[PDB]
């Protein structure tokens, strides 16, 4: 948590006006009025990393929901677990009227 | 004594010089910051001369026919970069070379 908080601090202390000179703008003969088609490439990466670091708990929650809902159905969806005599015997024992 | 500490970076040395240049014209009043600033300047100039002499001795006594292998140099460059920008170097990256 300390490492993650430090990284988020560093990302948030960046400037907003964070254009990037791409060295391929040579072939795009910019005339001081046009807009470079790659000014926002480091800004987009900074935003992506920051937001992904801020949505960590949401990913954790969805992951644990997926894991729980796929584990609860192990004995019904996985063949070598569903076909052992012990799991079959237990599932039969539950249904004894 | 007072013993103003050694400047950590070059900006600190620049601000030391600025402070000295501001203080100069009131020596009978300050009389104590000037001496510490000048001792620091003496130490810095001494270190610079020693560094110049050691660099001269180093560059003229390197080796006759030694060379650096490219693989190791590339690994060292990448590791230096990673360590410089606070990322992590995997454990199998330096012990094995």
């Amino acid at each position: 948590s300390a490492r993650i908080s430090n990284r988020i601090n560093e990302l948030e202390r960046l400037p907003a006006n964070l254009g990037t000179y791409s060295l391929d703008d040579c072939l795009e003969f910019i005339t001081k009025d046009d807009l470079s088609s790659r000014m926002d490439t480091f800004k987009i990466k900074a935003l992506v990393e920051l937001k992904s670091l801020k949505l960590l708990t949401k990913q954790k929650s969805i992951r644990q929901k997926l894991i729980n809902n796929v584990a609860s159905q192990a004995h019904h969806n996985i063949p070598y677990l569903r076909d052992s005599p012990f799991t079959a015997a237990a599932q039969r024992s539950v249904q004894i009227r | 004594e007072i013993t103003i500490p050694k400047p950590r970076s070059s900006a600190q040395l620049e601000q030391l010089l600025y402070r000295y240049r501001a203080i100069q014209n009131h020596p009978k009043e300050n009389k104590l910051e000037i001496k510490a600033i000048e001792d620091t300047f003496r130490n810095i100039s001494r270190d610079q001369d020693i560094y110049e002499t050691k660099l001269d001795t180093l560059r003229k006594s390197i080796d006759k026919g030694f060379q650096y292998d490219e693989d190791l140099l590339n690994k060292h460059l990448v590791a230096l970069q990673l360590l410089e920008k606070d990322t992590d170097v995997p454990d199998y990256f330096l012990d094995l070379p």
């Binding site: 490492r3 993650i4 949505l55 960590l56 990913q59 | 990322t87 992590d88």
Partner: peptide, 13 residues
């Protein structure tokens, strides 16, 4: 599938 946290988990352990 997004390696959001992998670097820090790896460097701490």
């Amino acid at each position: 599938s997004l390696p959001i946290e992998d670097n820090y988990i790896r460097e701490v352990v």
